[PDB]
From a paper:
In fungi, the only known non–BAR-containing SNX adaptor is the SNX3 homolog, Grd19 (13, 19). Comparison of the assemblies demonstrated that metazoan and fungal coats are essentially identical, and hereafter, we describe metazoan retromer:SNX3 unless stated otherwise. Using local reconstruction and three-dimensional (3D) classification, we found that, for both metazoan and fungal retromer:SNX3 datasets, the arch is asymmetrical. One VPS35 monomer is more curved than the other, and the two monomers interact via an asymmetric VPS35:VPS35 dimerization interface. This asymmetry causes the arches to tilt by approximately 22° away from the perpendicular relative to the membrane. Arches were arranged in a pseudohelical lattice wound around membrane tubules. The fungal retromer:Grd19 lattice shows less regularity than either the metazoan retromer:SNX3 or the previously described fungal retromer:SNX-BAR lattice. Arches are assembled into linear chains via two homodimerization interfaces—the asymmetrical VPS35 dimer interface and the symmetrical VPS26 dimer interface. The core trimer arch—the conserved architectural element of the different retromer coats—forms a scaffold that can contribute directly or indirectly to membrane bending and which propagates curvature over larger areas of membrane by oligomerization.
Residue numbers in the entry:
A (entry chain D), B (entry chain B): 0 to 146, 153 to 177, 181 to 195
C (entry chain A), D (entry chain C): 12 to 306, 387 to 535, 554 to 857
The structure:
Amino acid sequence: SMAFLILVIGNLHIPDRALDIPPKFKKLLSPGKISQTLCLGNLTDRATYDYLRSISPDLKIVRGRMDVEATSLPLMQVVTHGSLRIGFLEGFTLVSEEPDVLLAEANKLDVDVLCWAGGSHRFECFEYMDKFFVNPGSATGAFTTDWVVPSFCLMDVQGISLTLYVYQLRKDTENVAVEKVTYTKPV
Amino acid sequence: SMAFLILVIGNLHIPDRALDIPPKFKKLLSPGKISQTLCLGNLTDRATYDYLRSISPDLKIVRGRMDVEATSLPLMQVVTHGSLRIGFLEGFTLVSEEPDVLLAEANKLDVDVLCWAGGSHRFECFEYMDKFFVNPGSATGAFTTDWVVPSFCLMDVQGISLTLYVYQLRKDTENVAVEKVTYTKPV
Amino acid sequence: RLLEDALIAVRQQTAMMRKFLDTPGKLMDALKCCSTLVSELRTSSLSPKQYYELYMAVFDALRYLSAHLRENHPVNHLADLYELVQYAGNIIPRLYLMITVGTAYMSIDGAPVKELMKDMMDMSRGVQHPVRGLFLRYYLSGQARDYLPTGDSDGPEGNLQDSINFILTNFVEMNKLWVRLQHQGHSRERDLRTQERRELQLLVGSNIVRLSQLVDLPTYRDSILGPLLEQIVQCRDILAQEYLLEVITQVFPDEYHLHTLDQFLGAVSRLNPHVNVKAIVIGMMNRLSDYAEREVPLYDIFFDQVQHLVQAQHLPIQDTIALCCSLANLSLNIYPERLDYVDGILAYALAKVKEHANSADLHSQPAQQSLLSLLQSPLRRYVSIFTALSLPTYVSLFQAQTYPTRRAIAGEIVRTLLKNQTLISTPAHLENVLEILKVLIKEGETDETMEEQGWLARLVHLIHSDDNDTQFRLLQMTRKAYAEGNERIRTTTPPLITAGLKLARRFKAREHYDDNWSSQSSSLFKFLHSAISTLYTRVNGPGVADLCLRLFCSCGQVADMTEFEEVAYEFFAQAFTVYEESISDSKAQFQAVCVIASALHRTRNFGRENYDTLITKCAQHASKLLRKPDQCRAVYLASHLWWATPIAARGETEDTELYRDGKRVLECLQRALRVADSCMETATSIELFVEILDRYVYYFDQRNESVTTKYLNGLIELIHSNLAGNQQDSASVEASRKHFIQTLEMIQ
Amino acid sequence: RLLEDALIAVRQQTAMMRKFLDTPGKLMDALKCCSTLVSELRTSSLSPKQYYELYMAVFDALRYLSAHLRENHPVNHLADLYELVQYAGNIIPRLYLMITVGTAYMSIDGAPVKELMKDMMDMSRGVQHPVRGLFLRYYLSGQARDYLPTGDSDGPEGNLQDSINFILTNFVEMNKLWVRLQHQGHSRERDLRTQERRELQLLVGSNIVRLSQLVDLPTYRDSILGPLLEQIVQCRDILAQEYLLEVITQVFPDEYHLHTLDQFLGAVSRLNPHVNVKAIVIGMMNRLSDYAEREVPLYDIFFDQVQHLVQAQHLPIQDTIALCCSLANLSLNIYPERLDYVDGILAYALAKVKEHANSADLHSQPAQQSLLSLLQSPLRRYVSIFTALSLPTYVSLFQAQTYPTRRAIAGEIVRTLLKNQTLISTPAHLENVLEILKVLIKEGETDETMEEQGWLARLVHLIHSDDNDTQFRLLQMTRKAYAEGNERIRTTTPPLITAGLKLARRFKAREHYDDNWSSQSSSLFKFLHSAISTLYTRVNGPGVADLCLRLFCSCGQVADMTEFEEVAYEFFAQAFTVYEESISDSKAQFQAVCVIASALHRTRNFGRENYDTLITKCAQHASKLLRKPDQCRAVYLASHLWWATPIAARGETEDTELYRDGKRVLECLQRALRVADSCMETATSIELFVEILDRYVYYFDQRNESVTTKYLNGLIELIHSNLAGNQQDSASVEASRKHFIQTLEMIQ
């Protein structure tokens, strides 16, 4: 639709670890571009929250794994555009992943697109069981000794279709690299 | 002493397990007979309060274990008649029914006679550790926690001596039965 | 004054008359003076009371003269005296003298009785003044009302019929005079005239009294009431109809009236619309009410005819209701239990009352007051008020009572249903009582002060009257009926919890006669969970925690006894949930958690794996409160969670045998000591250490080997070092010393 | 009235003068009309503006006269005309005529110009009335403007001295008159007089402009400023001093001033404090500052003179600080940067100001406002304030600020230090920064990152700039700089934790450079434990538990990564200890146990004695939670302690495999089944059973021999029996059906 851009980002630690996303990314997330932002919490500061509501006319916030106090928020949220029900998460609430846990979770939620950013926070994606599974990686690039290029994603849902734009700040000099991905729900 | 008759009653459980004085007992306890009433709780309402007030010209009550909404009343009370000191409580501000614990509480309160109405809802009395222990049974006939004799007492203090009269509605059929018990304080 | 001047003249005339009566041959002089005296009664200027007083004074003097004559004839005679008294110049004296001599002749002369009596009555028709002729007829009545030509005649002149004729003719003349009283004097003194007539009503009714010493029922029918009814209906006045009909009814026998009831009702139909028919009809119905309360389908005949009469009128609604109340009084008193008659009152009055009631508000209306008295009449007259509940539409008409008064009447009835230690309420009676309850509870300081303590106790008692499983179904429907909001169930449901406590046992007393009794217990415990969850809607209240806490402990015990322990554990976990949401006042949590301790201190069906786990939970939440005294008190009580204590340690899981987990008990007591050292107040710290030492004495004497004499030695040394060495002396410090001395005495 | 009437008369006289000027030999008549016109100037009732305007009209007529004379001499002459014109009766016309004829003589014959100027200059000693003499001397200056004998002469006899004498003498006489304007007239017109002086100041300054279009720099030094300074220092007037000095500065070039700087500064030293020297000095000093910012030992001389002025000038404290601000701006323009000067500014200017600031209390006082502007002035003028930070004594001014302003300024600086990235700081400058931070933190919505939270994050960032050995020292000195208390370190230390996690790896990334990497890790782990234990002290807040748990777990992972696991196990046991001692809320416990599970799901390298011990403790902790739903959730997750999932299930025997203790996993699943049976809910229990069956399919495929397809099949029949036959329909029940259909699809 391009009227409803969804920002997908993670690994916040602001200022808990770092200062900002790339300036070029801040302008790519500047107000007037995104219609709704789905953030995964654990900010931890208020200025970034104010920035985030101001980025899009629709700010949606979910419960975070560092957000032990604001438990009232759900860990997942659905919005509907045409025929799609959309779930998203970070993933630590799972204990394995491989095929049965994703299928079981999809069945519990009955969704079509699933987003997560597990503690490894490294990009991958796959389609499975007529449902869609998305890992944006470590968007802000937070580090850990697990087995990241500054990045974020934009999503555009229309009907049974989802359009994903992945933005990366790649190294040779730091260069912004953009990729587009589209998803359409199978029947 | 005791030209000032003191009514001793317990395990009333109004409306908890039983609701009223036996009619023959209310008439034995009718106003103009009792000068002071020591009630062992579970009245619980203002109506029961005013009636009990009407029974005797000087009503002294302590907090009850289910009398949790009546924040104004004291939790425990001691009275002295001649050379005898008499303390009373329900047992909820007491901690258990162990002999040493009762003796220790009696020693802090400087009392010789203790009235209580535990879950047995059975009249009994015994002397132990030079002190006097009185359970009036259930003045209302409240059911027991054990595997039924309605009873109350009319304690009589004279000097260093206490005479206890227990009135019971005993079964052969409801019959009013009176028993006398005497307690004399150690020197 | 006029009265007094006349009374002076009367006493003067009585004085010379008596001096003449003394002297033989002065009798004629006594009569001349008597005529001069009676001339005073010829005045018409006296007030009614004054004329009455003058008549009475002259009457008593006339009685002296009349006795003198009634003695003179019995002893010699006086010739032609009946003729001689007709010589008198003044007509009122003359006629009084003829009556006096007539009665003297009647005493002396039996043969002339009919002719002389008939003559005196006919010639007394000459009196052209109503009042003077009426008073004259009293002189006649005192003289000769007792001598009439009657059954006392045995064959000569006179018979009971002649006396009946004499009195009926006297009635007609007195009635013509009685109406004529209405028309004498000026028209604007009508109320004064009616007052005078009310004064003179006894004059008419003395004849009725004389009639009631007379002939029987067929003679009553043909020759008294028949005549009396034509006159009663055609006289067309109000004071006479009401007075004369009530006097007839009391004075004549009602056995006679019964044989003539229909004649009475056909007379009641024969009256003016403009006479005070409402008063006569209300008074007749009230008399029939008396015919009912002094404890031929009279009901149907009188009932239906009374409706025709009311339709024949257009009545005030209040008057109609007062007649309905008297109709109720008649049916209730005549038919306390003929439910078909009572229902005919219920049916054949009430809807018609609603159409006749131009139903604006009617609370302060006496029609309302009467409708209450009417409804009370079943209630008062019932041996069994249940019989009111047997009327299908007795209760349903209470809906159609006006509504403030629906509260007043429904409250008063239900209270009366409670002062009587009343009987089984069957489902049918449960439904009618519940409908009454819905009116009380619906639509929703209690300016009612109703209702509940004797109300719940009575309700719980009578619930038991129906069979116990049904009682659960009834309790469940009542539980839906308790949709009234947040300030009822707190005081109403815990008694229902006890009703379930008895029913769970009633199931267990069939544990070898049923095995779904356990399943029935399962249904009741699911009910308990649902009803408690219903209370959790009522977050606004205190003790919401306390009551639930005691209910869960009670239910845990019942779950043990019903072996239905699976829903006990859940209830206890939910009780912990209650522990978390219920933190609002610091002191209140300390007392409540102590209550939690004591309930656990009886809580005995948890398997030890569950119990000790619970014990640790209790100890942690205890160890997460605010202040060190309370923290100490809870810690020393968690020592009692593992030892040969509490009531829990005499368990249905402990088989009365005690835990005695003395190693853990020692660890708890040592932790209590660790908290106790950090009181940072010398006196209270030492007092508590003495109490803890006493707890050590407790476990030593309970044979807790982990509680060693070395711990006692180190604690007594620390108490000795502090007690004297750094305590500022105080009443508490002295008590702590006395306690320590006692504790040394116990340790020997 | 008078001014316009006079102007009319002036126009009449100009008409008659010019009509005479047309005729040669009417020149004397033209002069008579010109004198009659200038007679209008004999009124003194005109305002300064009105008298000036009349002067302008007479001046304009004089322009006609002066051109006429400068034409008469070119055509014939009139002998002795300069003398002959001195016969005029009116003195002001006569002297204006003297100037006019004089200039005509200078135009006609250049040889007497020098001689004529001495005569004309001498005769200007007459008119000492300030207004009239000033206007006359203005006429003289305009007429005699172009004829001066000098090195710039016109060809008359005369050297640079004759013009210097003419202009200096003309300056002194007009300045004497101009000051006399202050005095002339009457005493209540002082403001009018000051107005007159401001009006006539151009007359005085035209001489200075004329001097600058005259003699050069050595002549300026010897024979211009000397006279000018003598007048400036000797007037003790205020209006003349500001005007005359600014005119000197502007009109003569600064190349000239530079040759006279010491003469200027010797004038700068005598400034009389009650003379409005402050305004003159601020405008001159500001000009020199501006001179500096157009960007002879002036710094030393002027610095010293400023001290002499301050000893002379003692001004209200705000005024003194504002002068200090301008002095700071001057120093900024002069010398912010060469370090000996920067220190001399700090001590002998800035310290001297602080000692001289005998200040009343001032944080909101404008003296503070100026002191802030003053201190900001180094900061603004430091384009590279880093070079300001190359003072060790950079902080030293913070010593001299009051605490409110030390905190306010340090905040503003640190904020500016956040709008910028501050450089890689050397170990030493980190301490200086720390002292600044200590001033910020001590004594004391922090959306400014108040006081340094995003600043702490940057600091942790900058730690990375140096290498591991320097980093260890920096981290230890910063950790000392973390003596700050319980309400601060919560938000500041976890970034230090990350600084240590990177430094521990930076030590490990030296295992082939120093095998003390284990020892380096050991020192860092003791340092970190000491800092976390510091946190443990400060239990007063939420997350104090959370944060300590996360840091201890994190250190456990670093110990894993470094294989420095010996200090890992202690930290994990201590974390369990934290769980037991400090965590209460059941829901909070659920989150904590899930994070603990996930952290184990990152636990790999422990020796099996430690590892397996942790696995069993963890299984116990799983078996020690609170709620039955939760009891199930923990039990199915403890299957993962044994199963072929997750990292926690790696034993050092499994060879990269996860325990796959499918026997134990089955025992766990049976425990989950026993917990499921005692849940007392149908839909979620069945849903959970389906999830467990899917987990069974998982364990079948992950090779649980104890998980068999027959068990799955029997469970699907039990699910089939439950799904339809006892599930009350709900979104969950449909999901459970969909899940069961999926699970059947999985079993194929």
